[PDB]
Design an enzyme around this catalytic site. Structure first.
Site, PDB file in Angstrom:
ATOM      1  N   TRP A   9      39.293  36.135  40.462  1.00 19.46           N
ATOM      2  CA  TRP A   9      38.293  37.088  40.928  1.00 19.46           C
ATOM      3  C   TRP A   9      36.907  36.507  41.197  1.00 19.46           C
ATOM      4  O   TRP A   9      36.336  36.730  42.270  1.00 19.46           O
ATOM      5  CB  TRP A   9      38.153  38.233  39.916  1.00 19.46           C
ATOM      6  CG  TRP A   9      37.180  39.301  40.377  1.00 19.46           C
ATOM      7  CD1 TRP A   9      35.891  39.467  39.956  1.00 19.46           C
ATOM      8  CD2 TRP A   9      37.422  40.329  41.356  1.00 19.46           C
ATOM      9  NE1 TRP A   9      35.320  40.537  40.603  1.00 19.46           N
ATOM     10  CE2 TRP A   9      36.236  41.085  41.467  1.00 19.46           C
ATOM     11  CE3 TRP A   9      38.527  40.685  42.143  1.00 19.46           C
ATOM     12  CZ2 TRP A   9      36.116  42.180  42.340  1.00 19.46           C
ATOM     13  CZ3 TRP A   9      38.409  41.787  43.021  1.00 19.46           C
ATOM     14  CH2 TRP A   9      37.210  42.515  43.102  1.00 19.46           C
ATOM     15  N   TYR A  10      36.366  35.784  40.218  1.00 21.45           N
ATOM     16  CA  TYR A  10      35.023  35.213  40.347  1.00 21.45           C
ATOM     17  C   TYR A  10      34.827  34.427  41.644  1.00 21.45           C
ATOM     18  O   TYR A  10      33.953  34.753  42.441  1.00 21.45           O
ATOM     19  CB  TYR A  10      34.700  34.296  39.160  1.00 21.45           C
ATOM     20  CG  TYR A  10      33.323  33.680  39.265  1.00 21.45           C
ATOM     21  CD1 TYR A  10      32.170  34.423  38.981  1.00 21.45           C
ATOM     22  CD2 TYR A  10      33.166  32.366  39.698  1.00 21.45           C
ATOM     23  CE1 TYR A  10      30.897  33.869  39.126  1.00 21.45           C
ATOM     24  CE2 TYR A  10      31.913  31.809  39.849  1.00 21.45           C
ATOM     25  CZ  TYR A  10      30.785  32.554  39.566  1.00 21.45           C
ATOM     26  OH  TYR A  10      29.552  31.967  39.756  1.00 21.45           O
ATOM     27  N   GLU A  66      41.912  36.845  45.619  1.00 25.02           N
ATOM     28  CA  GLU A  66      41.825  38.303  45.447  1.00 25.02           C
ATOM     29  C   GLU A  66      40.812  38.979  46.374  1.00 25.02           C
ATOM     30  O   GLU A  66      39.679  39.211  45.947  1.00 25.02           O
ATOM     31  CB  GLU A  66      41.495  38.612  43.973  1.00 25.02           C
ATOM     32  CG  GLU A  66      42.490  37.922  43.014  1.00 25.02           C
ATOM     33  CD  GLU A  66      42.159  38.040  41.525  1.00 25.02           C
ATOM     34  OE1 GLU A  66      41.522  39.014  41.091  1.00 25.02           O
ATOM     35  OE2 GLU A  66      42.572  37.145  40.759  1.00 25.02           O
ATOM     36  N   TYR A 114      47.617  45.124  35.743  1.00 23.41           N
ATOM     37  CA  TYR A 114      46.669  45.431  34.693  1.00 23.41           C
ATOM     38  C   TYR A 114      45.317  45.669  35.360  1.00 23.41           C
ATOM     39  O   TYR A 114      45.195  45.566  36.589  1.00 23.41           O
ATOM     40  CB  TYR A 114      46.609  44.312  33.622  1.00 23.41           C
ATOM     41  CG  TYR A 114      46.691  42.879  34.136  1.00 23.41           C
ATOM     42  CD1 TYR A 114      45.679  42.329  34.905  1.00 23.41           C
ATOM     43  CD2 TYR A 114      47.771  42.060  33.792  1.00 23.41           C
ATOM     44  CE1 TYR A 114      45.733  40.978  35.323  1.00 23.41           C
ATOM     45  CE2 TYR A 114      47.843  40.716  34.199  1.00 23.41           C
ATOM     46  CZ  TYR A 114      46.820  40.182  34.959  1.00 23.41           C
ATOM     47  OH  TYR A 114      46.865  38.842  35.301  1.00 23.41           O
ATOM     48  N   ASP A 115      44.296  46.002  34.580  1.00 25.82           N
ATOM     49  CA  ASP A 115      43.000  46.333  35.188  1.00 25.82           C
ATOM     50  C   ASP A 115      43.212  47.545  36.116  1.00 25.82           C
ATOM     51  O   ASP A 115      42.476  47.725  37.082  1.00 25.82           O
ATOM     52  CB  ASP A 115      42.437  45.160  36.025  1.00 25.82           C
ATOM     53  CG  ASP A 115      42.102  43.941  35.173  1.00 25.82           C
ATOM     54  OD1 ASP A 115      41.806  44.117  33.968  1.00 25.82           O
ATOM     55  OD2 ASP A 115      42.127  42.813  35.721  1.00 25.82           O
TER      56      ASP A 115
HETATM   57  C1  LIG Z   1      43.143  49.278  41.043  1.00 31.38           C
HETATM   58  C2  LIG Z   1      41.874  48.780  41.727  1.00 31.38           C
HETATM   59  O1  LIG Z   1      41.895  48.492  42.939  1.00 31.38           O
HETATM   60  N1  LIG Z   1      40.787  48.681  40.955  1.00 31.38           N
HETATM   61  C3  LIG Z   1      39.612  47.958  41.410  1.00 31.38           C
HETATM   62  C4  LIG Z   1      39.084  47.035  40.292  1.00 31.38           C
HETATM   63  O2  LIG Z   1      39.992  45.952  40.099  1.00 31.38           O
HETATM   64  C5  LIG Z   1      37.685  46.460  40.630  1.00 31.38           C
HETATM   65  O3  LIG Z   1      37.092  45.941  39.427  1.00 31.38           O
HETATM   66  C6  LIG Z   1      37.053  44.570  39.232  1.00 31.38           C
HETATM   67  O4  LIG Z   1      38.391  44.134  38.953  1.00 31.38           O
HETATM   68  C7  LIG Z   1      38.485  42.703  38.713  1.00 31.38           C
HETATM   69  C8  LIG Z   1      39.937  42.409  38.396  1.00 31.38           C
HETATM   70  O5  LIG Z   1      40.779  42.954  39.402  1.00 31.38           O
HETATM   71  C9  LIG Z   1      37.579  42.281  37.553  1.00 31.38           C
HETATM   72  O6  LIG Z   1      37.603  40.876  37.436  1.00 31.38           O
HETATM   73  C10 LIG Z   1      36.137  42.769  37.747  1.00 31.38           C
HETATM   74  O7  LIG Z   1      35.391  42.521  36.561  1.00 31.38           O
HETATM   75  C11 LIG Z   1      36.182  44.277  38.009  1.00 31.38           C
HETATM   76  N2  LIG Z   1      34.853  44.873  38.083  1.00 31.38           N
HETATM   77  C12 LIG Z   1      33.989  44.634  39.076  1.00 31.38           C
HETATM   78  C13 LIG Z   1      34.274  43.536  40.077  1.00 31.38           C
HETATM   79  O8  LIG Z   1      32.940  45.289  39.196  1.00 31.38           O
HETATM   80  C14 LIG Z   1      36.734  47.536  41.197  1.00 31.38           C
HETATM   81  C15 LIG Z   1      35.490  46.919  41.810  1.00 31.38           C
HETATM   82  O9  LIG Z   1      35.829  46.111  42.926  1.00 31.38           O
HETATM   83  O10 LIG Z   1      37.363  48.279  42.247  1.00 31.38           O
HETATM   84  C16 LIG Z   1      38.536  48.961  41.810  1.00 31.38           C
HETATM   85  O11 LIG Z   1      38.984  49.736  42.866  1.00 31.38           O
HETATM   86  C1  LIG Z   2      45.156  34.744  37.359  1.00 30.42           C
HETATM   87  C2  LIG Z   2      44.327  35.951  37.229  1.00 30.42           C
HETATM   88  N1  LIG Z   2      43.222  36.048  37.977  1.00 30.42           N
HETATM   89  C3  LIG Z   2      42.615  37.215  37.637  1.00 30.42           C
HETATM   90  C4  LIG Z   2      43.733  38.005  36.805  1.00 30.42           C
HETATM   91  O1  LIG Z   2      44.722  37.042  36.522  1.00 30.42           O
HETATM   92  O2  LIG Z   2      43.273  38.849  35.731  1.00 30.42           O
HETATM   93  C5  LIG Z   2      42.259  38.305  34.889  1.00 30.42           C
HETATM   94  C6  LIG Z   2      41.966  39.405  33.873  1.00 30.42           C
HETATM   95  O3  LIG Z   2      41.121  40.427  34.402  1.00 30.42           O
HETATM   96  C7  LIG Z   2      41.027  37.856  35.707  1.00 30.42           C
HETATM   97  O4  LIG Z   2      40.063  37.294  34.830  1.00 30.42           O
HETATM   98  C8  LIG Z   2      41.368  36.822  36.801  1.00 30.42           C
HETATM   99  O5  LIG Z   2      40.254  36.635  37.683  1.00 30.42           O
END
Ligand SMILES: CC(=O)N[C@@H]1[C@@H](O)[C@H](O[C@@H]2O[C@H](CO)[C@@H](O)[C@H](O)[C@H]2NC(C)=O)[C@@H](CO)O[C@H]1O
Ligand SMILES: CC1=[NH+][C@H]2[C@@H](O1)O[C@H](CO)[C@@H](O)[C@@H]2O
Length: 497
Positions: A96-97, A143, A213-214
């Site tokens: 992500w970063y 991503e 996840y997330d």
């Molecule tokens: C299901 C979905 O699309 N959710 C999105 C979130 O994933 C996203 O949040 C960010 O997700 C990243 C992992 O996928 C994290 O690394 C990051 O910390 C997190 N928060 C951020 C970037 O503010 C959000 C924001 O783009 O959107 C959702 O739709």
């Molecule tokens: C390989 C991998 N890349 C993503 C994902 O797994 O989820 C992690 C947990 O949020 C996040 O840190 C990472 O940027």
């Protein structure tokens, strides 16, 4: 049965590599030495992370990396192969970063896959980095590429596959070929970017590791489980972004494959992948989290689930208030919104006010701090029993997880996953998958076997007419259809013979 893959991320920040030590937990919380022989044997893959794509459009380590120390960390990982002949030390590019649309190196990803020349140069750099540091495979974590960047992403993957298959012959690795994998979207929104070409993306891969996840977080208005296996009707539902993907399908086809709104669950991501033709279940790997997400300002009534909250959703954590009671790790990381299973396990048993609850629809646990109004969604050895059974039932390639340093010191989560797949004395035949909501979409890739009388030329067919013909069951969308199923848009292919 072929062994299920168990893919764990080994993540280490640049500064930890530059100050690597296996004797000072306050400097390197999780050194390679913590991966005991026992743990090395329960893993099939370790994804070293994260590398990046620089301005020269090549795979490369963070420029600030002390190279010698990096090679030493990688060598320690590769040495673990002594305990497990199937072990592979992969390296991950992206995350992500580095690569999100607004990340610091995003442009490099877009630009590296742009032309036959950029792709060739990029693919070469991946293999070179792989051979130079001694890795066993390449994992790409972009991503995520958008619709216009997809054909280029695909060509890049095909190019790397070609070079890796060549390297495998050149290195005598027929028994343990070099591999190629990507971390794939585990949610419809991001998935919709390349969904239409899923088959081409997966073709050159050994595995597509779904980031299932997330799926919940402080950026959403209502608290929810971040990795629910199945849906809970009392929980939030989401717009099915997939129905808007450039598929070229009809209203009927789109509607039956993509019900909306739907429950954003692990099952949904897996089933959405299986709906497409040419996406073999054996290449699908289910990602699981070794960490939980926390929210503050939640209300009572459902133990903190599906409640409004007051948690900042931005990155970095836009505050210095570390409100996750008992989470020491959160103080050192300056973020009370995420906590390793290791830390959660300690918070739970330390009389801090948390109550562990269980949602039997989603088959996941959660914590509720009634006194302070906190809710934490996370996964544990129990939720892993269902995920492991699902992985077996659905004939998936295995499991993946983020990340090794978040397991407890005894490696219980990894051990549970390994047990559920391989222990001769573990029996989950009576484990009930429950009545949580299943994803109901049906696509070209998962049409069911059906029987229906055979089409009789000359008969006038009414609306909803089911006739078997040419190896498929077809249903009429409207009446007075007198044409043969297959060459009139009045027919809907609904099943296999
Ligand atoms: C299901 C979905 O699309 N959710 C999105 C979130 O994933 C996203 O949040 C960010 O997700 C990243 C992992 O996928 C994290 O690394 C990051 O910390 C997190 N928060 C951020 C970037 O503010 C959000 C924001 O783009 O959107 C959702 O739709
Ligand atoms: C390989 C991998 N890349 C993503 C994902 O797994 O989820 C992690 C947990 O949020 C996040 O840190 C990472 O940027």
């Amino acid at each position: 049965s072929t062994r299920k893959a168990v893919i764990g991320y080994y993540f280490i920040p640049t500064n930890q590599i530059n100050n690597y030590t296996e004797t000072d937990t306050s400097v390197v919380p999780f050194p390679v030495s913590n991966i005991t022989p026992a743990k090395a044997k329960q893993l099939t893959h370790i994804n070293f992370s994260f590398l990046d794509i620089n301005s020269n459009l090549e795979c490369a380590w963070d420029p600030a990396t002390n190279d010698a120390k990096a090679r030493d960390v990688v060598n320690r990982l590769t040495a673990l192969k002594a305990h497990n002949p199937s072990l592979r030390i992969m390296f991950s590019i992206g995350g992500w970063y580095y690569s999100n649309d607004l990340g610091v190196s995003h442009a490099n990803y877009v630009n590296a896959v742009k032309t036959p020349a950029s792709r060739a140069k990029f693919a070469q750099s991946c293999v070179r980095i792989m051979k130079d540091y001694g890795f066993d495979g390449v994992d790409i974590d972009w991503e995520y590429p958008q619709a216009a960047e997809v054909d280029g992403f695909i060509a890049a993957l095909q190019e790397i596959r070609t070079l890796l298959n060549q390297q495998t012959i050149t290195d005598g690795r027929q028994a343990l070929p070099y591999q190629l994998t990507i971390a794939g979207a585990g949610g419809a929104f991001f998935l919709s970017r390349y969904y239409s070409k899923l088959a081409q993306i997966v073709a050159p891969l050994d595995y597509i590791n779904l980031m299932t996840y997330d799926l919940a977080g402080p950026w959403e208005k209502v608290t929810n489980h971040q990795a629910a296996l199945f849906g809970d009707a009392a929980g939030p539902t989401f717009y099915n972004a997939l129905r808007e993907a450039n598929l070229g399908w009809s209203w009927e086809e789109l509607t039956r494959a993509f019900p909306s709104p739907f429950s954003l669950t692990v099952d949904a991501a897996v089933q959405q992948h299986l709906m497409m033709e040419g996406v073999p279940s054996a290449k699908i790997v289910m990602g699981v989290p070794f960490y939980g997400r926390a929210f503050k300002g939640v209300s009572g009534g459902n133990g903190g689930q599906y409640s409004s909250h007051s948690t900042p959703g931005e990155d970095p954590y836009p505050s210095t208030d570390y409100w996750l009671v008992g989470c020491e790790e959160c103080v050192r990381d300056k973020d009370p919104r995420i906590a390793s299973y290791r830390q959660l396990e300690q918070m739970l048993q330390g009389n801090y006010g948390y109550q562990r609850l269980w949602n039997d629809k989603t088959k996941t646990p959660y914590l509720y701090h009634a006194q302070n109004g906190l809710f934490v969604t996370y996964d544990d050895a129990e939720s892993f029993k269902y995920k492991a059974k699902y992985i077996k039932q659905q004939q998936l390639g295995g499991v993946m997880f983020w990340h090794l340093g978040q397991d407890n010191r005894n490696g219980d989560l990894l051990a549970a996953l390994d047990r559920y797949f391989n222990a001769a004395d573990y029996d989950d035949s009576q484990l009930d998958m429950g009545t949580g909501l299943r994803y109901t979409g049906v696509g070209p890739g998962n049409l069911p076997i059906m029987t229906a009388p055979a089409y009789v030329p000359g008969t006038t067919y009414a609306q909803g007419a089911l006739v078997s013909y040419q190896g498929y069951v077809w249903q009429t969308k409207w009446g007075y259809i007198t044409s043969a199923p297959g060459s009139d848009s009045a027919w809907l292919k609904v099943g296999r013979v």
